[PDB]
């Protein structure tokens, strides 16, 4: 904890230097931060071990950094590692050695796995363990006794209090191993789900499942892969391995349809088995081996309609061997977390790309679903060609003097509309769409403010999607955008920042955002991150632009929301000005047009 | 540069400098490519030659080289038109030159120079010498204002720190030579020695100063014989720059860490690595302290780890671009003192005053549409007098 003169954590009195440090690429500070080198000959071996024990904090192209947390270690033991194996290899990798504090810390968070297990059977939840002593210790805890239902020893626990039990179990240093023994579970009938030979999983996809199925039993946890990496295939493959009834929880009506199509494309399951449970319609969820729905539908708290209530009654009174939870990072929400207890599932698999949230509830996924089983490196996949290369940028659009006059003075939350509706910003978006369309690029434009989305959509005469648009109508636009050459640019709102699969969307633009939501930014860039047909690894196939207003609060949010992407190596080149704009017939070229726009923005309030 | 320095000298000192042959050879060597031949031609000649002949000895192609070399030598006053014979002393002295009449050292030079840099920054462990302290303070790169208290670093002092060791040393000698005359030390004696080194009381003091900077080393309790170091005649990088504003400095020296800490925040310290983050707060502080962005990019550029060398640009463009934007952000408002004139009732005469202001070179900005202009207060009286004259 010694601090140098330059506010630096002096760690020279703490650890020594290894003589053969040149070959060893790892640093290990007593704070737990681990700085691995990406140019070392032994990087590949170190990364896989390190990513498991420590969740990456930043992974630039040269020197990566990781942090050691109790949850990060608890994932290491679940996959198959052991304290002796981790510390010995860590010492072998360390070019400075492991400080005594970290060495004991690693040991502390490894003698907690396997002590207690959670088993669901016959619609009943039981706390299983082979050591009566640890169970007795738990019983001493008040809340643990409170949630109790009102050799190996097991006591039944009420479903409604599973969350509180799990949260306290971690707090008692006794994580519950919610591990599903699907291969030794004949009670639940085996479904006809099978992986067609045409579907081959990429090395990272298979590696993620290997951690999930390291032993015969199936592990429940959160699997993180970059947007467009193919999490749909991994989720489908997990169901194929389980061969039991599978529940898939998307994020919206668009998510389930793509989940439905991916199952058909990447699995032999017949169309009759696949079903949807959404407000738009339902494919007889009462009879179906694979159910696809949305958190909103299942997590709905108010009284459900008769059509939905009947399905909900069936869902609660069922046993699911695998509950795939797409967009896991939304789970720790107050109500969406309830969907875990409402539905009965043995193994909960979580798929997501941006395991980040502006609150501190992202850690709750450790016990709500399980430890982070895997986390692929974005740059590693980007160079391999599995995900398109993106040249992120931040177009600096100077604020209009008439607008800035009002923005500086106004502070009653009306600023957002003012600098979202920047005529200078509009022209950059207008020019960018025109230039990129001439290059046969499929443009996507995002805007958190629907007002801004509508203003830009009609003015450019381009399709726009947001809340009120019916599921069929928005689905139609995507199909037109996917295939119709005429529809080269689409406008989307907060609805389509996640789960939208547009493989051919080379270009992306963003004219607005909801504060510094790193999750929103990384998710939004995901739409165009899908692998392209004629993609070349080092040709910058895709592009991302985040229009911002200079000398405005949007600058602070623009830097805030770039934190996650830069942590993965993405560099956000700054574009002060765009060439060729002057010679272009763009809108708002006269003060009268800009003057008219400002009045309308003020009127909206 | 060295040739630059000689040009800025009087003819009297130059001829005195052209003393023992080694000096003439030293000044000869810096003749770029052409004038070296011309010197050999009119070396055995005792009779001046026409200026036209020199002009026509160079083909029309690459003619600009003919003039530039001639101007350089005219500045050096090697020859005179004499109406182009060389200096009789230079011709004679040069003719004397032209057939007439280790690993420990580099480490010593690097270390002794480093301790001076250590003293430059607020390093408690640095060589202390009253003569050296006043030398730097009078060199224009440091200021004390209180002899009892250790001196601080001036705005130019911080920039000097980032400069590469060759340019860092040369600038110091250049300042040293200029102040040698003011303190009473003859410039020719020291300047002649530097040339002779490339191959009296004044020298004894000068040699001691050179010993202090680590350029020369007697090794024998200050004997007559000295052993100049590599730097006296006139290295792999260790910094890894990331796209997320992170510097990993593979440094064992406290000086380099002190340098990098100037424009970045130090996070962790490891024996062969230090983690620094280039936060805008630090860079803005570095720019405010006096540093120039180009130096920061250059300082990181020169001390670039080998791994980054293969990449092009070695420094990721966003980092270099971002540093510049942090620099340019501070100077958004360009303050400029001036005097404004308005109520220009005489619209016709306003242009005449505008023309008069332009002729004097005082006008900074003007607005014909609003009939107004701004003039610096230095020239305010001149324009005010012109208006009063009517």
């Amino acid at each position: 904890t010694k601090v140098d003169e330059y506010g630096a954590k002096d760690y020279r009195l703490q650890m020594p230097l290894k003589d053969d440090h040149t070959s060893r690429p790892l640093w290990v500070a007593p704070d737990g931060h681990i700085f691995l080198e990406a140019f070392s000959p032994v990087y590949k071996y170190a990364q896989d071990f390190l990513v498991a024990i420590a969740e990456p904090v930043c992974r630039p192209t040269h020197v990566h950094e990781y942090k050691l947390t109790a949850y990060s270690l608890y994932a290491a033991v679940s996959v198959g590692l052991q304290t002796s194996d981790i510390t010995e290899y860590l010492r072998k990798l360390s070019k400075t050695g492991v400080p005594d504090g970290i060495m004991q810390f690693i040991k502390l968070c490894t003698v907690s796995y396997g002590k207690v297990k959670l088993v669901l059977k016959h619609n009943r939840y039981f706390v299983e363990s082979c050591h009566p002593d640890v169970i007795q210790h738990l019983l001493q805890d008040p809340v643990i006794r409170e949630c109790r239902l009102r050799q190996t020893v097991s006591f039944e626990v009420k479903q409604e209090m599973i969350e509180e039990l799990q949260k306290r179990c971690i707090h008692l240093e006794y994580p519950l191993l919610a591990e599903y023994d699907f291969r030794n579970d004949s009670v639940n009938p085996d479904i006809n789900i099978d992986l067609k030979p045409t579907a081959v999983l990429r090395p990272y996809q298979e590696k993620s499942l290997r951690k999930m199925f390291g032993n015969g039993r199936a592990r429940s946890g959160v699997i993180v892969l970059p947007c467009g990496a193919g999490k749909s295939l991994v989720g489908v493959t997990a169901a194929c391995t389980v061969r039991k009834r599978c529940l898939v929880l998307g994020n919206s009506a668009v998510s389930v349809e793509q989940w439905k199509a991916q199952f058909k494309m990447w699995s032999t399951i017949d169309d009759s088995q696949i079903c949807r449970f959404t407000s738009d319609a339902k494919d007889k969820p009462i009879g179906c081996s694979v159910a696809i729905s949305t958190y909103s539908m299942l997590g709905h708290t108010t009284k459900r309609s008769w059509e939905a209530e009947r399905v909900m009654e069936w869902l609660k009174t069922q046993e699911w061997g695998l509950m795939i939870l797409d967009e896991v990072h939304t789970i720790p929400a107050k109500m969406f977390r309830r969907v875990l207890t409402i539905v009965q599932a043995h193994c909960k698999l979580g798929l997501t790309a941006t395991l980040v949230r502006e609150d501190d509830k992202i850690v709750d996924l450790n016990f709500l679903i399980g430890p982070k089983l895997y986390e692929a490196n974005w740059m590693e996949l980007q160079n391999n060609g599995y995900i398109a290369k993106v040249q992120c940028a931040e177009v600096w659009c100077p604020m209009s003097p008439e607008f800035y006059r009002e923005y500086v003075a106004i502070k009653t939350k009306k600023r957002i509309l003012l600098y979202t509706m920047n005529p200078n910003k509009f022209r950059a978006c207008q020019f960018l769409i025109k230039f990129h369309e001439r290059r046969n690029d499929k443009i996507i434009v995002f805007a958190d403010n629907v007002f801004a989305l509508k203003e830009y959509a009609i003015r450019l005469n381009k399709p726009y999607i947001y809340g009120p648009t019916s599921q069929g109508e928005r689905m139609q636009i995507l199909q037109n955008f996917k295939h119709n050459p005429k529809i080269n640019t689409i406008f989307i709102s907060k609805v389509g920042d996640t789960s939208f699969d547009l493989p051919e969307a080379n270009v992306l633009i963003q004219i607005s955002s909801h504060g510094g939501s790193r999750r929103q930014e990384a998710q939004r860039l995901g739409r165009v991150l899908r692998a392209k047909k004629g993609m070349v690894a080092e040709e910058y196939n895709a592009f991302f632009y985040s229009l911002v207003s200079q000398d405005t609060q949007e600058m602070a949010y623009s830097t805030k929301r770039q934190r996650f992407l830069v942590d993965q190596g993405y560099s956000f080149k700054v574009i002060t000005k765009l060439a060729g704009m002057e010679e272009e017939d763009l809108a708002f070229s006269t003060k009268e047009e800009q003057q008219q726009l400002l009045q309308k923005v003020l009127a909206a309030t | 540069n060295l040739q630059e320095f000689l040009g800025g000298l009087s003819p009297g000192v130059l001829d005195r400098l052209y003393g023992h042959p080694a000096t003439c050879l030293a000044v000869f060597r810096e003749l770029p490519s052409l004038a070296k031949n011309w010197v050999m031609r009119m070396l055995f000649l005792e009779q001046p030659l026409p200026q036209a002949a020199v002009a026509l000895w160079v083909k029309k192609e690459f003619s600009k080289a003919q003039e530039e070399s001639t101007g350089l030598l005219s500045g050096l006053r090697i020859w005179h038109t004499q109406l182009l014979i060389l200096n009789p002393i230079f011709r004679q002295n040069l003719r004397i030159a032209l057939l007439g009449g280790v690993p420990s050292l580099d480490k010593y030079a690097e270390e002794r120079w480093e301790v001076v840099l250590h003293f430059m920054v607020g390093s408690p462990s640095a060589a202390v010498s009253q003569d050296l302290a006043q030398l730097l303070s009078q060199a224009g790169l440091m200021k004390s204002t209180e002899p009892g208290e250790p001196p601080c670093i001036t705005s130019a002092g911080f920039q000097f720190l980032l400069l590469d060791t060759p340019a860092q040393l040369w600038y110091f000698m250049l300042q040293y030579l200029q102040t040698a005359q003011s303190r009473g030390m003859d410039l020719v004696e020291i300047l002649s020695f530097l040339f002779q080194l490339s191959f009296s009381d004044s020298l004894l003091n000068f040699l001691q100063h050179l010993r202090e900077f680590g350029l020369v080393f007697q090794r024998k309790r200050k004997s007559r014989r000295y052993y100049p170091t590599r730097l006296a005649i006139n290295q792999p990088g260790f910094i890894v720059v990331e796209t997320n504003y992170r510097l990993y400095a593979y440094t064992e020296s406290e000086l380099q860490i002190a340098l990098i800490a100037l424009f970045s925040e130090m996070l962790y310290r490891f024996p062969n690595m230090v983690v620094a983050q280039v936060t805008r707060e630090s860079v803005q502080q570095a720019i405010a302290s006096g540093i120039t962005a180009q130096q920061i990019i250059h300082f990181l550029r020169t001390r670039a780890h080998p791994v980054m060398l293969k990449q092009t640009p070695v420094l990721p463009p966003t980092i270099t671009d971002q540093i510049r934007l942090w620099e340019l952000e501070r100077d958004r408002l360009r303050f400029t003192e001036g005097v404004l004139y308005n109520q220009f009732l005489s619209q016709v005469d306003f242009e005449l005053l505008l023309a008069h202001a332009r002729e004097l070179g005082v006008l900074v900005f003007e607005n014909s549409a609003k009939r107004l202009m701004v003039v610096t207060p230095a020239g305010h009286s001149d324009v005010k007098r012109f208006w009063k004259r009517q």
């Binding site: 940028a393 230039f435 290059r439 574009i575 | 671009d321 510049r324 934007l325 620099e327």
Partner: peptide, 15 residues
């Protein structure tokens, strides 16, 4: 063959 625009290709900073 559909090269990148000027702004993305080379720095746009005045410095």
């Amino acid at each position: 063959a559909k090269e990148r625009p000027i702004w993305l290709r080379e720095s746009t900073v005045q410095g």
